């Protein structure tokens, strides 16, 4: 957004996250043995899913794969959900030990309310496309139209590229997996459990397919990544 400051020829080239295939190219590129068993291509699609296409953390990841085995690679894949990015924090071509020190700053610069919105988007399902009303439940605000959730969730995606806007089929945002496990081991352990419950309230009223408005009352489809959140908040 620093560009609204200018009045000029402003042209943009956006660096998106590395596609599932480029990650392959990148691995082959720095000496990585490619899978054979099915549960080896899966080890690597897990890493690629977790570090939601991210050059820097992918890099700490290879650099931290010590024996080079697919095995110790899935070890790191374990190490990643249950100790956060700190399981793979390393000396890297990046000036920073782990991706959390970088996103750090990005969160500090943030509008105070956006700091809030962000702090709560923990209590979501990661790598899942989900509607504005499903966000109006955990996200704060100072009536009957909650688009304000959307202005905030947009500023949040423009400014460190933390969310992810996707216009149709229906107006939905998304938190990636790296941009989430940052928030896991970083927000106040309480505000997680407050979001799970403050969610389970609105949670009742009267695959490549979005969750229909006939089936929102049950977020239980995503029970797994919530059981992981309640098990977390109770340690």
């Amino acid at each position: 957004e620093i560009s609204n400051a200018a009045s000029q020829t402003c042209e943009f080239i956006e660096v998106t996250s590395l596609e599932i295939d480029e990650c392959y190219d990148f691995l082959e590129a720095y000496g990585m043995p490619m899978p054979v068993g099915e549960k080896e291509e899966d080890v690597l699609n897990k890493t690629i899913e977790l570090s939601s296409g991210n050059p820097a953390t992918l890099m700490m990841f290879f650099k931290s794969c010590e024996p080079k085995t697919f095995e110790k690679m899935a070890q790191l894949n374990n190490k990643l959900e249950s100790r956060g990015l700190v399981g793979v924090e390393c000396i890297t071509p990046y000036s920073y030990k782990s991706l959390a020190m970088a996103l750090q700053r990005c969160v500090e610069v943030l509008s105070d309310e956006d700091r809030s919105a962000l702090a709560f988007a923990v209590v979501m399902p990661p790598g899942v496309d989900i509607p504005v009303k499903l966000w109006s439940c955990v996200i704060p605000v100072d009536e009957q139209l909650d688009d304000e959730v959307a202005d905030r969730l947009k500023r949040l995606s423009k400014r460190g590229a933390l969310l992810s806007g996707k216009r149709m089929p229906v107006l939905t945002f998304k938190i990636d997996h790296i941009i989430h496990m940052f928030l896991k081991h970083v927000v106040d352990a309480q505000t997680i459990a407050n979001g799970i419950s403050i969610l389970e309230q609105r949670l009742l009223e009267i695959e490549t397919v979005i969750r229909p408005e006939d089936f929102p009352k049950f977020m239980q489809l995503h029970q797994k990544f919530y059981d992981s959140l309640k098990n977390f908040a109770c340690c």
Binding site: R115, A119, F182
Partner: peptide, 6 residues
């Protein structure tokens, strides 16, 4: 609320 901003 935010473990020292991260």
């Amino acid at each position: 609320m935010f473990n020292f901003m991260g």
